[model samples]
Each structure stands twice: as C-alpha cells, then as structure tokens.
Target: MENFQKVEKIGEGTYGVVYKARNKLTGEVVALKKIPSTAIREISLLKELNHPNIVKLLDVIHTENKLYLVFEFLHQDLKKFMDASALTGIPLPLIKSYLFQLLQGLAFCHSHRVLHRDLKPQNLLINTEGAIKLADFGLARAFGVTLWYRAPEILLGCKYYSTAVDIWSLGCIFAEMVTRRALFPGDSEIDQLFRIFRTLGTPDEVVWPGVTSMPDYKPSFPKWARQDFSKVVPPLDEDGRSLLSQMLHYDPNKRISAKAALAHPFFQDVTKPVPHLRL
Candidate 1:
C-alpha cells in the first residue's frame, strides 16, 4: 500500500471510500477503492471482469481492516460531465459519441451475462477523448436505493429479475441526456413508478404480461395517456428515440438487449471501431 500515494478523495461509492492515487512504482494514476469484509462479493465479481468499457480492476491491496481495489483512472464521471453541460446542454456530436460508447460498454457487460443492477449516470466514467465506460459495481448484485433508475419489476417486488433491468436504467440515463433532467426523479419507489407510468403511460397485460400479478403490484394506478416523448426531449432524433423506446420497453421480455443496441441505426454514424477499447 505504501507504493501508492493517495492524491485525493475520489468520492464515496456504494460500498466504500474511493481515492485517486499514483502508483509510485509505475508513476501511473489510478483509482483505489477501499472495500470492507462484507463487500467480498464485489471483489470476487470485479476480479473476473475484463473489458474496455468497464473499469479495469488493476490490482488489490489489503491490510487487516480493509481490502483496497485498484482501477484505471478516468478524468470524469457522467454526473460531473452532465452537470457541467447543464447551462446549454452538451453538443449533438458529443452526445451521439457518448451515448454510443455507453451502449457499447453496456453491450459488453450484458454479453458477459453480468447484470449491472445499479447502473446510473454517476457510475459511468469518461475520458477526455469522449469515450465512456461503466464502473462502480459495488452494488451490481445488491439492490436498494437509486430508485429512479430501478426497473418496475424491482419496484413491484419481483425478486427474480434480469438484464432487462439494466436496459431500463440505460433508458433513464438516455432520457436525462436528452432532457438534462431525470425523466423520473421520484422521491420514493411508488413515486418513481408513478412518474414512469405517467411518461410511458400505465401498462397493461397486453404490453406487460402479469404486471398486476407481482407480489407488490398494485391495480390502483391511473389510466395515464400515451407518451409523446418527442415533446419531452425535443433534441433527440428518430433513431435515438427509437432506440430509447426499445430499451425502455416496460416488459423485460420485450426490451432490447445490449448487443442489439450496438447495431441500432442510432450508431450508424459512429464509423470508427474502438479497437483499443475491448468492450
């Protein structure tokens, strides 16, 4: 641990404190996350993951009280990136490139069959070159909090969920990118569900089979009107909106996969292959 000098505190993550550090041995900048004994699952899962779009788990260091995980350094996270752009919003070109990279990263994670159950804007790391990558898997398998980004099945107490939950999260992130505001910034679980049905309209068995049958499902929601997302996010084009619609599909059965997302027409203009980026 002495070989790495902590430069600054990165931020508080889901599990532990994170710090920006420089490895004295290699003089390379990196992120060091301090993990407690209870977070052993994160260590086990992270060590097995290796992808370009995902944060690289470089190494681990441990002392008697804590386990420290090392990761590649990224200049900014999506939250900070978006906050800086709140004045006038990010440019179209940058938005396209960023969204494409985000989907590419997600596709890689989804292909690996690992559900990033807690994906949100704060978890996305970005480099100066406009490339975005997934990070902060501390709660990837754990569930709770960040309700606005959670899927309906989770809100309805479906203990057995799937990758479609992550797709739903991606949809929310995409919505924020277009509107510069959380599409469903609800204060609670039920409120979040209400905001969602209000935007996408209340679901039925035809669109989401057995929605009312979930353990916590309620039949009390209003018959909200159909969505006109164009008015919600005026800047997003047809291709972007089309992709968002599929990813945001209420039925996990009908939601599109990350692999399919990469091939969507929304990315037709992203010609350059990220050969250096493995995910």
Candidate 2:
C-alpha cells in the first residue's frame, strides 16, 4: 500500500514532476518523481548505483498507468542556490566543495559505463548540510524535457555520444559557479550551437578533426575565434580556468575524463574528506 504523503510540488525534471513528500510511517521526507510508464533505464541503472554523491533511490512504485520513483529529499538545486548567492557571491570554498562532489559522482557513473546525458545545475541537488548529489542521471534521455548544457557533438547532430557529453555540461556548470551567469544561454538548437561557437569559437578540423563531417556540420557556418577563458570566466583563477577549458573541449576524444578531472591541480587545495550523508 501507499505510505508516502505528498507535501508539495518541488520541481519538474526532464521526464517527470517531482514532489516533496513524507514517509507516513517514519516521518521521513523524500522526493517523489511521477513519470509516465514509458521507461526502465532509470529504474535499472539507479538500482545498481551506490555512491554518496549520487541521489539514493529508496523505492519504486509501479501502476498500470504510471511509475513513481522515491529518492532522498534534498533541500534545493544548484540553480536556485546560485541565484540566491548572486548578490553576496558564492564563496570559493563552497564552489570547490560542490565541484569536487560533482566530479566524484560523475567518475562513479563513468566507471560503471553509464552516461549522465543531462548534467546541469538543475540536475544537481544540494542538501541542508550543503552536500551535492547528482540527480535524474539516466532518466532524462529516456524522457531537454534544453540545449544549453548539451555538448558540441550533440549540437552538431552526432547520433552516438559517450561520457564526454557530461564533461561539457560540467564545464558549463563550473563556469556558472564562478561567474554566476550561464556560459551559453542559447534558446534553440541552432541558436545554441551559435552561442557555443561564439563563446569557444567555431570548431574546425584543426581543433577537432572530423568535426566538419558531422551530420549537421555546414561549411558555411560562421567562423569565430575562441575567447580567452580569463576574459570569459574572470572570477576563476588560472588553474580553475585551465580545468574548465579541458572539460569543454570540442573533440570528445580529447575531453578530460571525470576520473582525470578529479585529480587536476585545481582541486589540490580541496583536501577535505568530502561531503557526508546529510539525509
């Protein structure tokens, strides 16, 4: 029987409506994601995943018409936190903490041969103790249900992708954390590509071999020189900017892996034992 009470609507994910709910028996709060009966990847994939930085799935309820996912409730998403810290500014220590947790979660996913196709601020949840956890990992592809955090290859119409797509989005989130502004805020598919090109410069064979031959690549695409990261992400230090640059590489083959990214010198000062379970 049902033992959870819907407290209120929290937010919408790429595939479903998420609500804040409470476990009637234990008075435990949780996130309930209600989605249509059209997917199994989320259930299967998340069931096998066990990481502190990854959202914990507590239960699954199946009905004739729809499916429900029960997850550990987090206080807010990264986007909301960023917006709130706009005036006072997000401290550097907090930024380091969040980024480290994100990479840890992603590394775990990549190690398991899973790709978090959709990685954005909205998909990153934060708990009351400020611990960061990756949410809605495989659920989105089965479902943008946006193009902003999409990788260059995806934007260029590449049919197949890998873990690199998640790195590109991580770069975007990293930039946003420091600048408190979106790295690329494009509105449509083509427009999104233009925004990326304009910021990182249009990719060609020189920087990314075979990019010109992508399914959606065009010879007439406008050319733009890459802007210096220092100029774009002014608040970030040199090492920080360097790491972000690697994450946003145009060639997926050359992009940094989450495992390697965690070892980057940029996080050398982040010697804390990492976030603990706040749920």
Candidate 3:
C-alpha cells in the first residue's frame, strides 16, 4: 500500500469505492477499488480474466478490514463519452468499433463462464485511443443485470438463468449507441418489464416458450405490439436492427451468444485487427 499514492477518488462502484492512484515506484497510473470481504468473488473472477477488451487486474493489496484492487487506469467510461456527444450521438465508424470491442470482451467473459450481471455504458471504459474495455465486474456471477438493460427472464423472476442475460443488456447498449439515449428507461422492475414488453412486445409461449410459467408472469399482463426496430432506432441500419432483435430475443435459449454476435453482418464493416481510431 505504501508503494502507491492516491491521487483522487474515482467514485462508488457497484460494490465498493474506487480511487485513481499512481504507483510511486514505477510512476504508473491505476484505479484502486476498495472492497469488503463479501466481494471476494469479484477478485477471484477478475484475476482469471485476460483479454484486450477487458480491464486488467494489476494487483491486490489487503489489510484487516478491506481489500484494495489495482487496475490499469483509463480516461473515461462509455457513458461519459456519450455525454460528450450529447443527443447527436457518436459517429458511425466509432460506434461500430465500440460495439465490436464490447462483444469481444463479453465473448471472452462468457467463454470463461463469468456473467457480468451488470453491463452498461458506465461499465465500459474507453481509453484515449477510443479503445473499449469492459469493467466493473463487482456484480459478476452474483445477480441480475441492471433494471433498464435487464433481460426478460430476470424481470420475470426466473431463478435459472444464463449468459443470455448479458446479451440482452448488450442489445440495449447497441440501441443506445445508435440513438444516444436509453432504449428502455423503466422506473421499477415491473415498469422496466412493461417498457420492454411494449417495445419488443409481450412474449407468449410461441415467441418465448414457457414464458407463461415464469414466477412473475401474469395472465392479465397487457399485450403490447412489438414495434419495428427501424422505427425505434431510426439511425441503425437493417443489419444492426436484425442483430439487435436476435440479442434481445425473449427466449434465453434462443438469444445470440457474444461470439455469434461478433460474426453477425452488423459488424461486417469493421476491418478487424484492432486499433479502430483514426490517425
């Protein structure tokens, strides 16, 4: 702990308080997350992860009452980037680059059997080069996705869930990238479900087999017609619209995997090999 100097507090994370600090020995910048004993799983999970699009866990320092996690520092999160863009939204090429990096990060996590229960723009960090990295795994393997980006199964109180939940969140994130606003900003769990139902339509057995049997499903739930993705996000292209629909599929079993999504036509224009920034 004496080897590093705390420059400033980053902010509160899902499970802890984060700080931006500098390594006195090497003059390197890093983010330090101070967590309690209960979030030990996050450290375990992050320690096992190694990917370009995922935040790096540099080191872990602990004392009697707390654990401080060290991570390579990045300039800002996707939310702040989007905020800088305002309502006009990010450029097409940049959005394409950002989405591809997000998928790559998620695919790696899913392959490792780690579910980032919390996936949002706020958790996606961006560097000065416009590269994206998934961060804040505090809720990994512990809970449901956030309210607005949460999947249908979770909102329906389905105990048995899978990586499909993260796919649903990425779907919302994809939409937000194109629209520069939240696709479904629901106030409560039920309200969020209704927002999703209204936008994607209330799922029946045909669309989502066994949906009616979910603990939270109600016979009297309003039947909302599914709106066309083109209309919902006017700026997104047809291929992207198709890709988003698949990721947002009501049936967890039918939702597209992060790996499969990377191969989708929506990302065909991205010329791989990394380094998406313009010189």
Candidate 3 residue-wise lDDT, 210-272, digit = tens: 999999999999999999987888878898889888999999999999999999988878843
Best by lDDT: 2
Whichever of 1 and 2 has more TM-score, that candidate is 2
Error of 1 at 272 (Å): 6.9
Cα lDDT tens digits for candidate 2, 11-70: 886567889999999999999988733456557656678798999888777766567888
TM-score of decoy 3: 0.91
Ordered list by lDDT, greatest first? 2, 3, 1
Off by over 4 Å in 1: 36-42, 142-145, 271-279
The clash count of every prediction, one per candidate, is 0, 0, 0
List the global CA lDDT of all models.
0.80, 0.85, 0.82
Sorting all predicted structures by TM-score, with the top scorer first, yields 2, 3, 1
The alpha-carbon deviation from the true structure for residue 31 of candidate 2, after best TM-score superposition, in angstroms, is 0.3
Show the colliding residue pairs in model 1.
none
